Structure formats: C-alpha cells, structure tokens
Amino acid sequence: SPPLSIMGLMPLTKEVAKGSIGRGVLPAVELAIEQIRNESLLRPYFLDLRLYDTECDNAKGLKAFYDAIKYGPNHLMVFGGVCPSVTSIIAESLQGWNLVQLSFAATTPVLADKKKYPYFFRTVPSDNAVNPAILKLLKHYQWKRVGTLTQDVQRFSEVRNDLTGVLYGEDIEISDTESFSNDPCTSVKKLKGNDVRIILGQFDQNMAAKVFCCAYEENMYGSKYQWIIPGWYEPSWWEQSRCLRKNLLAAMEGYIGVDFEPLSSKQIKTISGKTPQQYEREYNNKRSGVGPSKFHGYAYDGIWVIAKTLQRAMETLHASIQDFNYTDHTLGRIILNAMNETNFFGVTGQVVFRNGERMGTIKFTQFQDSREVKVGEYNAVADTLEIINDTIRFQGSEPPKDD
Amino acid sequence: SERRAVYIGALFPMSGGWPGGQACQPAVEMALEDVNSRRDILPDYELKLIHHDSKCDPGQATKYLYELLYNDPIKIILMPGCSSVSTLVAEAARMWNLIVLSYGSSSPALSNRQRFPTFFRTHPSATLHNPTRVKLFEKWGWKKIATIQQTTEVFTSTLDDLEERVKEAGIEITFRQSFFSDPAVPVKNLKRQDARIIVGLFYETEARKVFCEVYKERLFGKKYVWFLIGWYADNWFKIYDPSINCTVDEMTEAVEGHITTEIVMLNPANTRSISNMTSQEFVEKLTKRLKRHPEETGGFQEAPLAYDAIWALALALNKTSRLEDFNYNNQTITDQIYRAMNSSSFEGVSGHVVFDASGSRMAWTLIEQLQGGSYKKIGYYDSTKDDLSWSKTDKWIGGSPPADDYK
Ligand SMILES: *[C@@H]1O[C@H](CO)[C@@H](O[C@@H]2O[C@H](CO)[C@@H](O[C@H]3O[C@H](CO)[C@@H](O)[C@H](O[C@@H]4O[C@H](CO)[C@@H](O)[C@H](O)[C@@H]4O)[C@@H]3O)[C@H](O)[C@H]2NC(C)=O)[C@H](O)[C@H]1NC(C)=O
Numbered sequence: 001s002p003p004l005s006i007m008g009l010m011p012l013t014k015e016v017a018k019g020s021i022g023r024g025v026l027p028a029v030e031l032a033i034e035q036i037r038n039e040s041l042l043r044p045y046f047l048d049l050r051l052y053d054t055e056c057d058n059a060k061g062l063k064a065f066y067d068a069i070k071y072g073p074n075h076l077m078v079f080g081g082v083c084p085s086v087t088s089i090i091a092e093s094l095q096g097w098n099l100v101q102l103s104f105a106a107t108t109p110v111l112a113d114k115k116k117y118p119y120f121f122r123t124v125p126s127d128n129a130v131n132p133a134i135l136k137l138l139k140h141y142q143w144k145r146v147g148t149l150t151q152d153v154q155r156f157s158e159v160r161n162d163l164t165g166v167l168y169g170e171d172i173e174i175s176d177t178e179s180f181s182n183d184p185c186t187s188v189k190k191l192k193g194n195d196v197r198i199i200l201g202q203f204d205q206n207m208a209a210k211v212f213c214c215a216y217e218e219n220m221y222g223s224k225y226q227w228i229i230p231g232w233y234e235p236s237w238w239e240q241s242r243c244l245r246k247n248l249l250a251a252m253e254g255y256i257g258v259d260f261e262p263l264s265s266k267q268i269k270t271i272s273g274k275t276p277q278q279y280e281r282e283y284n285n286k287r288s289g290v291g292p293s294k295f296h297g298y299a300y301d302g303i304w305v306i307a308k309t310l311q312r313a314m315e316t317l318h319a320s321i322q323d324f325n326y327t328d329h330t331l332g333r334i335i336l337n338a339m340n341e342t343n344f345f346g347v348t349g350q351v352v353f354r355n356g357e358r359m360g361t362i363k364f365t366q367f368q369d370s371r372e373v374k375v376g377e378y379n380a381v382a383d384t385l386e387i388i389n390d391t392i393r394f395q396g397s398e399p400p401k402d403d
Numbered sequence: 404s405e406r407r408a409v410y411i412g413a414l415f416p417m418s419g420g421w422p423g424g425q426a427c428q429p430a431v432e433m434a435l436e437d438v439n440s441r442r443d444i445l446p447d448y449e450l451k452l453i454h455h456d457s458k459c460d461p462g463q464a465t466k467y468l469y470e471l472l473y474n475d476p477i478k479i480i481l482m483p484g485c486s487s488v489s490t491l492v493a494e495a496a497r498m499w500n501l502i503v504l505s506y507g508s509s510s511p512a513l514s515n516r517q518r519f520p521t522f523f524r525t526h527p528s529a530t531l532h533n534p535t536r537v538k539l540f541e542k543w544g545w546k547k548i549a550t551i552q553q554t555t556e557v558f559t560s561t562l563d564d565l566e567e568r569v570k571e572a573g574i575e576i577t578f579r580q581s582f583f584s585d586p587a588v589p590v591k592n593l594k595r596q597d598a599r600i601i602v603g604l605f606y607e608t609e610a611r612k613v614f615c616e617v618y619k620e621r622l623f624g625k626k627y628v629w630f631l632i633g634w635y636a637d638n639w640f641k642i643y644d645p646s647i648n649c650t651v652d653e654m655t656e657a658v659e660g661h662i663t664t665e666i667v668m669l670n671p672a673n674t675r676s677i678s679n680m681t682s683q684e685f686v687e688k689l690t691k692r693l694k695r696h697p698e699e700t701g702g703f704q705e706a707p708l709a710y711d712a713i714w715a716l717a718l719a720l721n722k723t724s725r726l727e728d729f730n731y732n733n734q735t736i737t738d739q740i741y742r743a744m745n746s747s748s749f750e751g752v753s754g755h756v757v758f759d760a761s762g763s764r765m766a767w768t769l770i771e772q773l774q775g776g777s778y779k780k781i782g783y784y785d786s787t788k789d790d791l792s793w794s795k796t797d798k799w800i801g802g803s804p805p806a807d808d809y810k
C-alpha cells in the first residue's frame with residue numbers, strides 16, 4: 001500500500017520531563033493507527049506516522065523538524081507539538097512547507113492567532129477555554145461581582161487578559177484586579193478589604209498553597225466565599241510555611257477547579273465503534289508500564305482527525321496525492337479546508353474546530369474534605385452548563401452572595 | 404595556488420517592521436568587494452554571500468534558515484538583521500556550531516550568552532541608552548527618577564536594565580508606570596506623585612499621545628525634564644494625528660527642553676577607517692548603489708553597522724586564518740572564530756568596533772535637547788572609556804537644570 005506520511009513531533013526521551021506526555025500518548029496513537037489500518041479506512045493507502053524527538057528544546061526541536069523534511073519521507077501534515085515555545089516556532093513556519101499541523105497537547109492561547117499561525121489546529125482546548133465555562137458558572141449562581149487573583153507569569157496573565165473580553169457585554173463586574181509575583185498575601189488582603197466574595201484565581205500549584213494560607217489568615221473562606229481556580233494541579237498537591245495543614249484544608253474547602261475534560265462521560269459509541277469507557281480500558285491495557293497521560297484521548301482523536309481529513313482530501317482530488325512535495329500550495333489548502341470540516345463524536349466528545357481551536361468540554365471540580373470531586377461540565381459547542389445534582393455543596397443554606 | 408571560497412548565510416529584511424535589508428544588503432556587497440580586493444586581509448580566501456529576504460518575520464526566516472543549512476555550500480557564519488529573526492537564528496545556531504552576527508538587532512534579550520552562545524552584533528543593544536542616562540543624572544545631580552513606558556518587550560527589558568544601573572550609581576527609580584495604547588492614566592499619576600525627572604520609552608504614534616496628555620496636565624516647564632529616545636521623525640510633535648486633541652503650538656510647547664539619547668551609527672569625525680573611507684565617502688558610495696533615494700531606503704542609518712559587520716568577520720577570520728574544513732558537527736573552528744570575534748578592536752565606518760562579554764556592540768551615544776522646536780547637539784557619551792564630550796549648548800529656564808524634588 002502507498003504510504004500517507006505524517007510528521008510526528010513530540011518529546012519522547014526520558015531525559016526530558018515532558019517526554020512523559022509524548023510517551024504517555026503513544027499507546028493511544030498505536031490504537032487509532034492499528035484500527036484505521038485494519039478497517040482499511042484509507043484504502044488503497046495506509047497512514048505512515050514517523051516519529052521525531054523535539055526534546056522540548058527550541059534548537060533541538062527545530063533541527064528535528066529540519067532533519068525530518070531533509071531525510072524523512074514526504075510528510076502530508078504535522079502531528080504534535082507539546083512544549084509551547086517549540087510549537088510556536090514550528091507553527092509559525094508551517095506555510096513555508098504547506099504543512100497543516102494538528103497538536104493534541106499544546107494549550108498556549110498564543111496559537112489561536114490565525115494571522116501568525118494559519119496552518120495550526122489543536123484537538124485540545126487552550127488555557128483560555130476555561131473562561132466561557134466560568135462565565136456560565138457565574139450566570140448559573142447569579143454571581144455578578146467578581147475579584148481576580150493572578151500570578152505575574154505569562155501562562156496566567158494570558159488567561160486573565162482573555163477573561164476581560166469574555167465578561168465584556170455580560171452583566172458581570174470585576175470589582176478588584178490583583179496581581180502578585182512571589183507572595184499573594186498583600187493581594188489577598190486587598191481583595192478582603194474591597195469585600196470580594198467570588199475570586200477567580202490564576203496561579204500555579206506552588207502559589208496555590210500560599211494563596212489558601214493567606215485566605216485562612218484573612219478569613220477569606222467558608223459560607224461567604226467562592227474560590228474558582230485551575231483544575232490541572234497534581235492530586236495531593238497541598239501535602240507536598242506559616243499555616244498549618246488543617247488550616248490550609250479549612251481555607252481550601254469548597255474551591256472550584258476548572259480544566260479541560262480528559263474523556264467524554266457519555267456512554268455513546270464514538271467514530272471507532274467504541275464508547276469512551278471501552279477506549280479507556282483498551283488504552284490502559286496497551287500502555288503497560290508507561291505512565292498514563294491526560295492528553296491520551298486528544299492524541300487518539302487527533303489520529304482520527306488526520307484519517308478523516310486525508311479521506312476528504314482524497315475525495316477532493318478524485319472530484320477532479322503521492323507527489324506532494326512541500327511546494328504544492330493547492331494540496332495544503334485542500335488538507336486545510338478538509339480539516340476545517342471535522343465533525344465527529346470522539347473519545348473526548350464531539351471533535352469540532354472554530355478557527356483552528358477546539359470546541360470541547362470543560363470539567364468543573366470541587367475540593368471536598370480530602371480531594372477534588374467532579375461537580376459539572378461545560379459544553380463549548382452548545383455553550384451549555386450541566387451541574388451534577390447532589391455533588392456540589394456550600395457551607396451555608398444558600399450559595400454565597402457576590403457582595 | 405587558488406583562493407578558497409568561504410560563505411556567509413545572510414538574511415535581509417526587504418519588507419516588514421524594519422525593512423533594513425534595503426540599505427544593508429548593498430552595504431554588505433560593498434564591504435565584501437572591499438575586503439576581497441585587499442590582499443592583506445584574507446589573501447588565501449574569497450568571502451562570498453548567499454542571502455534570502457526574511458521580510459523581518461521569524462516564520463518566513465525559518466524557511467530560509469533551512470535553505471541555508473540544508474543546501475551546499477557549507478556556510479561558516481549566519482548574518483540576520485531583525486531582532487525577531489536573530490532571536491530565532493541565534494538560538495537554533497548551536498545545533499550546527501555556527502557563529503551568528505547581526506547587523507540590525509537592538510533587543511536587550513539578545514545579550515544572553517546562555518541562550519545565544521555564539522551571538523555577536525555590530526548594532527548595539529537598546530540598553531546602550533542607560534549608561535548615558537545615569538551619567539546625565541549624575542552630572543545634573545538627580546537621584547530620584549520616574550519611568551514611563553509603552554508595553555513592548557524592548558521597552559520592558561530597557562527599563563529592567565536601567566534599574567540595575569541606577570542602583571550602582573546611587574540613584575533610585577521613584578515610580579514606574581506602563582500603558583499599552585492609551586497613556587492618560589500613567590501621565591496623570593506622574594503629576595499626582597509630583598515626578599520631575601521622567602524617562603519615557605515609546606514609539607512615535609504613542610509619543611504624540613504621551614505629549615498631548617503632557618500638555619493637558621501641565622507636565623512640562625521649568626520643574627520637568629523628559630528623557631526620550633532620539634529616533635523620532637524630524638518634526639514628530641507637529642505631525643497630524645486625528646487621535647490627539649492638542650494643537651501643533653500646544654504640542655511644540657509640551658516638548659520644549661526635553662533630552663534625547665541616540666545610538667551613534669556613523670562616526671561624526673572626518674577620520675579614515677580600515678577601508679580608508681571617511682563616514683561621508685561611505686554615504687556617497689552607498690547612495691550610488693541604491694535604486695531609490697536614502698529617505699525611501701529602509702535601514703539607511705544602520706547600513707554602516709552592516710558594512711562594519713563584514714569587516715569584523717573578515718578581521719576575525721584573518722586572525723584564525725583550515726576555513727574550508729568547517730563542518731556543522733564540529734566546535735573546533737567555531738570556538739576559534741568566537742575567540743577572534745570576542746577580541747575585535749578596529750575602526751569602522753560606524754566608529755570604533757568592540758563587543759562586550761554578551762557579544763553586544765559598544766558605541767558612542769548622541770545627546771540632544773529640543774530648543775525652540777528643533778534638536779540641538781548638546782554632547783556625546785562613551786560608556787566604555789567614561790568620557791563625556793560637552794558642547795555647552797544646553798539651556799534651561801532657571802539658567803541651570805531643575806531638581807528631582809519639591810525645593
Ligand atoms: C586613503 O585616502 C586617500 C584617498 O584619496 C589616499 O591619498 C592619496 O594617496 C596617493 C598616494 O598613493 C597620493 O598620491 C598622489 O599624490 C602624490 C603627490 O601629488 C603623487 O606623488 C602620487 O604619484 C605617485 O608617484 C608616481 C610618480 O611617477 C605616479 O606615477 C604614481 O601613480 C603614484 O601614485 C599621486 O599623484 C594622492 O595625492 C593622495 N591624495 C590625498 C587627498 O591624500 C591614500 O593613499 C589612501 N590610503 C591607502 C590607499 O592606503
């Protein structure tokens with residue numbers, strides 16, 4: 001069978017920390033490739049995924065890309081890009097080789113700029129995708145006044161900057177905007193002073209424990225308060241200086257965590273004929289000793305996006321592929337228009353793009369006594385919120401008031 | 404015997420944010436002709452140029468960087484222009500053991516040896532304005548300085564460097580304000596906090612907005628001294644902009660007396676450099692090669708740095724003197740060119756060429772003051788030798804400069 005070559009770009013080496021994402025997703029990738037080949041979905045052709053180690057480094061990642069174009073087969077598209085700076089470099093240059101890229105793990109909002117990154121697509125929602133979800137949560141609980149607490153690091157300030165445009169033209173007031181670099185205590189005292197009740201927090205796992213320490217000291221917890229913070233922290237992250245552990249847990253009690261949903265909760269058959277639950281069992285058996293990655297479903301659906309895209313492109317050519325050097329502008333545009341048509345039910349839910357960006361599912365969690373528990377989900381396609389009955393709880397008789 | 408061809412991989416921005424390659428490519432071509440015609444520089448070698456238009460775009464540059472590295476002949480050096488293109492090529496370079504030499508990069512971030520280990524530039528860092536600023540503060544006895552910037556990476560980095568420089572000199576930054584597009588709130592705060600000595604870092608469009616707000620708030624006069632970058636168009640404050648409320652007369656009033664610092668890119672002296680040209684002769688020679696007038700040509704003012712970049716490399720290659728055996732997988736020759744480039748000391752058309760530990764060019768600064776709607780040369784400062792040339796052309800209302808505080 002003639003091969004349909006795809007350039008796999010990701011950190012794979014054990015020497016690089018992010019190599020766990022690349023390795024954690026390969027069993028999922030193997031599963032989708034195996035099925036597509038068995039079903040002969042791409043008949044007469046077959047999907048040829050070639051893997052190249054970026055090592056999560058700008059120079060090594062660029063040379064890996066350059067070496068793939070030079071010595072590798074003729075790739076039709078790019079699959080991957082995990083680390084934000086390496087992905088930005090490759091994604092900005094794509095047009096030069098008429099290569100469409102689909103990432104499954106690069107969540108940096110920067111990449112949504114189609115003036116800079118027109119050939120870039122991602123199956124994973126970006127860090128900003130939590131914002132239309134939070135707006136729905138605020139509307140649901142009648143929270144019209146909010147305060148913000150942001151760490152002065154690009155990852156977080158990007159999210160806070162996006163929140164401004166999401167809450168604009170909506171009946172929601174950001175009464176207090178507070179930033180911090182090393183210590184949140186001064187900013188937490190200012191929020192308390194301005195009588196903020198609903199706090200939208202954007203900060204890392206290390207700063208989170210400091211935030212909740214200050215919260216306990218300033219009594220910014222309990223029935224009167226609602227903290228809405230990142231949902232992507234390690235489990236038992238708080239266990240890992242002035243506050244006590246019991247006092248941290250007391251201030252942490254009831255916080256809402258927000259992050260993308262790793263897999264669909266719907267027991268409905270996907271494009272592969274398996275439900276998300278069946279795929280998850282298949283993935284856990286196949287991964288063996290390799291540690292699981294939360295991006296696995298996004299990588300699995302990613303392969304299906306490529307296969308379906310190649311199918312549509314093959315039809316477009318037949319309506320009128322082998323000699324695709326990186327010079328064929330027309331084929332690149334065909335692949336680009338075919339990927340824009342993507343609309344199927346995958347393991348991560350409905351796989352659809354809005355200007356290269358994934359319209360997906362956002363998970364809502366709540367810290368309850370010892371851990372984060374799922375309390376809801378936001379559907380970005382329908383722009384709908386579903387709050388799980390008899391899970392979410394408030395210390396008072398009613399959810400807190402915003403003033 | 405025959406002369407061995409040795410190749411430079413260059414990127415020229417013919418369009419984009421800084422279309423500097425328009426005047427910098429002919430300047431490089433002239434410099435190569437000059438070095439190649441001299442039998443005392445590289446008699447065994449012929450320096451050749453292989454180039455591409457980067458369009459001052461990193462994405463576009465990534466396609467041509469590949470074209471330079473993955474096609475014969477082997478290049479011994481990479482020559483990018485724009486800071487964005489240099490940030491891309493100087494970071495990638497270590498993977499092919501390549502020296503990177505920029506003729507147009509101003510970004511303070513490019514003076515990071517950890518990240519850009521083989522990087523040199525004949526264009527100085529935007530931080531070169533800072534030692535001149537600290538020296539003017541010291542001369543005028545100010546220890547309390549306010550800073551206002553437009554939000555851009557270049558301005559943030561320049562003010563970050565100014566902080567460490569003031570601390571050494573026993574000077575402190577009182578207040579630091581920032582704005583993305585509208586400077587109404589930051590200027591109002593400068594009046595409220597009673598700021599007297601102000602360093603303002605912004606582009607031309609934003610400078611007009613700053614100075615309109617400066618008129619409305621009476622933040623000009625005897626009490627105030629503004630420090631700006633001397634890179635603006637001839638009568639920038641008079642330039643019509645419908646986004647601003649203030650009139651030309653009101654604006655000529657607001658800008659009166661302000662100080663500017665500018666990087667010297669052409670030796671003001673009538674001396675002859677290593678090519679045996681004068682600064683004036685180089686300008687005449689370059690104008691002839693150009694299809695259009697210097698005013699229409701991008702990078703005309705930076706063109707002497709591009710000319711000097713070729714000589715810096717030619718002299719470095721002459722020290723090492725072999726060259727044909729250069730391979731991307733070997734550090735040997737690279738480390739030798741590096742040491743030779745690091746020890747550069749010669750007279751060029753832009754002035755005396757030397758690099759600091761970061762690989763960044765050390766140059767003179769031109770100090771000017773706006774006196775009656777016109778800039779007047781009040782002096783020059785040499786950061787390395789700590790020597791200030793004073794013109795005695797500066798003027799103040801009090802007959803002497805004001806003070807940083809209430810008194
Ligand atoms: C750098 O800058 C200037 C560029 O204008 C150069 O100065 C010129 O250098 C010439 C010396 O080579 C100098 O020579 C001419 O003037 C002399 C007196 O009029 C005269 O004697 C010379 O003739 C030479 O002698 C024999 C006589 O048989 C001739 O047949 C030869 O052709 C000789 O050249 C020349 O007429 C010229 O006047 C001078 N001009 C100025 C303004 O300085 C300088 O050399 C340059 N340096 C370099 C190239 O290293």
Ligand SMILES: *[C@@H]1O[C@H](CO[C@@H]2O[C@@H](C)[C@@H](O)[C@@H](O)[C@@H]2O)[C@@H](O[C@@H]2O[C@H](CO)[C@@H](O)[C@H](O)[C@H]2NC(C)=O)[C@H](O)[C@H]1NC(C)=O
Binds near residue numbers: 341352
């Ligand atoms: C790119 O696609 C968009 C959106 O397309 C839809 O969603 C896909 C998942 C799939 O189901 C498609 O068949 C859908 O059409 C296009 O924007 C739409 O354009 C059509 C007109 O043809 C119009 O019905 C819609 O209003 C548009 N949708 C939105 C959200 O604006 C767009 O034309 C495509 N661009 C291309 C091919 O260049």
Ligand SMILES: *[C@@H]1O[C@H](CO)[C@@H](O)[C@H](O)[C@H]1NC(C)=O
Binds near residue numbers: 443444445721722
């Ligand atoms: C070039 O190097 C040679 C070798 O020592 C030296 O004689 C010559 O003067 C050098 N040229 C310059 C202009 O420094």
Ligand SMILES: NCCCP(=O)(O)CC1CCCCC1
Binds near residue numbers: 485507
């Ligand atoms: N004197 C030449 C400066 C070129 P630069 O360091 O790339 C910064 C430029 C590029 C974009 C527009 C204006 C600033």
